[PDB]
Amino acid sequence: GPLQCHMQAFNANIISVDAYSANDLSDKHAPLGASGYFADVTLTGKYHQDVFDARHWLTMRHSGTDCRNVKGTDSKVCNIDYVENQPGNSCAQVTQRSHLLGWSSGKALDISATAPNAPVHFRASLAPSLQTWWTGLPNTCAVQRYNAPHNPYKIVTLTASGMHTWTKLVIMLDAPEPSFFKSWSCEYNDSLSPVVGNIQVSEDGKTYTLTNVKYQPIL
């Protein structure tokens, strides 16, 4: 399968994640209707070799194709009226899966091949009073809330099926954990390998910031 890498908090909980996903998954030379690569930033409560085996997961997925070619976006592409279907388009969508509550596809944002080349900004943020997670793409229509899980999110997983860069990842904890820095580990596929441009930590030890997380082919 695709490459999955994760960092894991043990006593602290993850309370916020922003991810900036580079626009590099689509192919402007492909025929209409073809798919490209995809990349996810996923939150879970327990460790899993394949994060999507988890009984409950919340993912922020970037797909290298028009949303019309992504199954489960029907009637959920909130900017469908403004983006003509075109080769080189991309799609951004939040999805929560739960073995108890079901498969809940969030709103999807279509991205034009003619739009300025810029990273896609995903955010998932806990509202502790509301006991819900704000999710989606800030300053766009593709936004919704999800109820917090019984087991709070403690693991963030980055998955990609091909070469991809997350230009920026900001993870925030409800309490400091120095071990979070070194919890980085992958389920390797001997096909892609990771490299991180830079990792920083805030003064209070709450906010970890990764710069230029790149999955690239080994051979």
Residue numbers in the entry: 23 to 241
Structure paper excerpt:
The protein fused to a C-terminal hexa-histidine tag, was expressed in Escherichia coli SHuffle T7 cells and enriched via a two-step purification protocol combining nickel ion affinity chromatography and size exclusion chromatography (SEC). Diffraction data were collected at 2.01 Å resolution at the EMBL beamline P14 (Deutsches Elektronen-Synchrotron; DESY) under cryogenic conditions. Due to the absence of known structures suitable for molecular replacement, we employed isomorphous replacement using single-wavelength anomalous dispersion data obtained from selenomethionine incorporation. Amino acid residues 23–241 of Llp1 could be unambiguously assigned to the electron-density map and represent almost all the residues of the protein construct employed in this study (Note: N-terminal 22 residues comprising the signal peptide were not present in the Llp1 expression construct). The secondary structure elements are connected by several loops, which contain four small helices. In total, the molecule has three exposed disulfide bonds probably conserved among orthologs. Overall, this results in a compact and stable molecular fold. Taken together, our structural analysis shows that Llp1 has a high structural similarity to members of the carbohydrate-binding concanavalin A-like (ConA) lectin/glucanase family. Despite extensive efforts with microscale thermophoresis (MST), we could not detect the specific binding of Llp1 to a variety of sugars such as chitobiose, chitotetraose, N-acetylglucosamine, rhamnose, cellobiose, galactose, arabinose, mannose, maltotriose, and glucose.
In this study, we biochemically characterized one such protein, UMAG_00027, that is highly expressed during plant infection. We show that UMAG_00027 is a secreted protein with a lectin-like fold and therefore term it Llp1 (lectin-like-protein 1). Llp1 decorated the fungal cell wall of cells grown in axenic culture or proliferating in planta, which is in agreement with its potential sugar-binding ability. CRISPR/Cas9-mediated deletion of llp1 reveals that the gene is not essential for fungal virulence.
